[PDB]
């Protein structure tokens, strides 16, 4: 699963929310958060699209978008407010074990970068979504309703942080809807010096190795060497 | 399979018994065949073919390890033992080969008369 | 009077790097799972008693 700022359709922890980092005091390192229970997210593109074919050469066709029938509305995702509040409370409780009993922990949105990094980017049934998660990370913690994230759609895609190979995604016909589980986070910390009693965490991501490091973290590969020599008191006849 | 990794040496001595994916499969098959053949040949050149515990004719040099038989088979694991005698493995391996060649020559000499 | 004895099948292992292949549960998909080996229905797992190993999440090959 390729996504940023949010791990989807993965595995869950078994006892508590897990916080992992290479060096937790180095703020240049990403923090990986593994959830205990998943958070449902509903994403939809509600336009009824149309596809047309244009012959650009002998045996070559280009699939363009025709006319949307009906009204034109914005694509969006929905998350539950209470479940997100509970999950953030648990994450804060487990994060305080590395920063102390009495530190103020606040969540603020991302800051700077390209659209892939500053937004929750994913792919729902052919279409590529980039959603604004400024309502997910906006709070401060001191020791029925829904949250709607508006999303944009892009058709020319640059993957794997490469330059020189773009890809065009042909249109998908009809309304699009999907349901996913949020099961983790990728976070970063700000370098607050000069006797800072508060810590600020911002969503991160962009490198896909951290996505599959959250699945291959309990595995290692070893080589078997089933041949040994030892001393005894017995001799070959 | 690897179930006696944490037991003593003596306890463990009783229980010794194209495309992206298509290219990766073939290398694994070749590696498995290579490893099996190498182990079988190494066992064979020592005269130990067809056995899981094989008695040799090479005396143990006390400079390899000076411990008694009580703190080897009742106090260590094979992973601990492998860390001690890792520097002397090739010496013993050459000694075994020379010893087996001498045995072959002696058997030929016995059949000669 | 001690002699060398050879044991074939001892439980020793070392850290290594190798090529892992793919197995998938038994057509046009980006990751060609149709070219992968079928999966065993009930895989075998062996618990290793009295064994402590060292893992590193951030240097996995």
């Amino acid at each position, epitope marked *: 699963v390729v996504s940023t700022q949010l791990l989807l359709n993965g595995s869950l922890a078994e006892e508590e929310v897990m916080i992992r980092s290479e060096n937790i005091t180095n703020n240049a390192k990403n923090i990986l958060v593994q959830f205990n229970t998943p958070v449902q997210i509903n994403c939809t593109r509600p336009n009824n699209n149309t596809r047309k074919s244009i012959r650009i050469g002998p045996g070559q066709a280009f699939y363009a978008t025709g006319d949307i029938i009906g009204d034109i509305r914005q694509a969006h995702c929905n998350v539950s407010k209470a479940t997100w509040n509970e999950t953030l409370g648990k994450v804060v409780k487990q994060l305080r074990k590395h920063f102390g009993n009495n530190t103020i922990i606040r969540f603020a949105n991302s800051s700077g970068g390209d659209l892939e990094v500053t937004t929750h980017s994913f792919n729902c049934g052919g279409e590529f979504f980039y959603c604004n998660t400024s309502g997910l990370f906006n709070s401060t913690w001191i020791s029925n309703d829904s949250i709607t994230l508006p999303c944009r759609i892009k058709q020319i895609i640059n993957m794997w942080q490469r330059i020189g190979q773009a890809m065009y995604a042909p249109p998908i016909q009809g309304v699009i809807r999907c349901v996913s589980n949020i099961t983790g986070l990728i976070l970063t910390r700000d370098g607050g010096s000069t006797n800072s009693t508060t810590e600020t965490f911002r969503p991160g991501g962009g490198d896909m190795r951290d996505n599959w490091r959250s699945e291959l973290y309990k595995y290692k590969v070893v080589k078997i060497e089933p041949l040994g020599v030892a001393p*005894t*008191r*017995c001799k070959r006849r | 399979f690897l179930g*006696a990794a944490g*037991s*003593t*040496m*003596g*306890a463990a*001595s*009783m*229980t010794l018994t194209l495309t992206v994916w298509g290219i990766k499969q073939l290398q694994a098959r070749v590696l498995a065949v290579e490893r099996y053949l190498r182990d079988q040949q190494l066992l064979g050149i020592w005269g130990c073919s067809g*056995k*899981l*515990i*094989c*008695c040799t004719n090479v005396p143990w040099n006390s400079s390899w390890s000076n411990r*008694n*038989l*009580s*703190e080897i*088979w*009742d106090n260590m694991t094979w992973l601990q033992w492998d860390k001690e005698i890792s520097n002397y493995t090739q010496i013993i391996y050459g000694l075994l080969e020379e010893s087996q060649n001498q045995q072959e020559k002696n058997e030929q000499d016995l059949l000669a008369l | 009077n001690l002699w060398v*004895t050879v044991y074939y099948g001892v439980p020793v292992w070392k850290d290594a790097e190798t090529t892992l292949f793919c197995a998938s549960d038994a057509k046009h998909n980006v990751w060609a799972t149709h070219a992968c080996v079928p999966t065993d229905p009930n895989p075998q797992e062996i618990h290793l*008693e009295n064994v402590t190993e060292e893992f590193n999440m951030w240097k996995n090959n």
Partner: antibody
Amino acid sequence: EVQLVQSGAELKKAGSSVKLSCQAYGVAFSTYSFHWVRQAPGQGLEWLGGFIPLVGKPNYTNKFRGRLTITADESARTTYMELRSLRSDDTAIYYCAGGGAYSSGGGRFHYFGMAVWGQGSTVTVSS
Amino acid sequence: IQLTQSPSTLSAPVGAGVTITCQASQSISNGLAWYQQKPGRAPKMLITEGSSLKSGVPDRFRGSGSGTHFILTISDLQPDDSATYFCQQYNTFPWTFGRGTKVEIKR
């Protein structure tokens, strides 16, 4: 640490049978060696029988041939000693002991003695 | 195989060294062990393989010998050492014990 736990005291009559159990903790049961040793009041130690669960063939002294049986339950990690046709001289304290062994291949097993002992069970044969 | 222990009883002061001799009817190589038993308690193994000391045993106990003669030496006698010492052979079945040597502290 390896620990052996035995059953409680027993009173029996002459001609009856007695069964004692010994449960092992902290070792792989199948590859360990278990032995039974009895002590009469005011006397020395006597070896009755020894047995490795994996091999499964107990070894007995000739004085107790036909009256002594040593069995093992691997799932319960227990070993049982059964003595039959009890006599007045069979009143004693019975200990269950354990020790490690190793193999050099070809039916050869070498031992180190009994390193772990149980607390003992008192068996009294009287009317 | 019969194991003969000498002496049957022994009394010595604290800090003194005592010697117990175990003799085998036939050779048993190194398969001899020394056990100590206190009244009302299970035996505790002191020496294995004739001369190898068990873990946790004080160094004042030493074992020696081979063939058919073995020796157990207690160099620094202590009041805690009053007990019965046994030699046991485990080289050949059936395993046999000695008749025991009683060591008493003289004060």
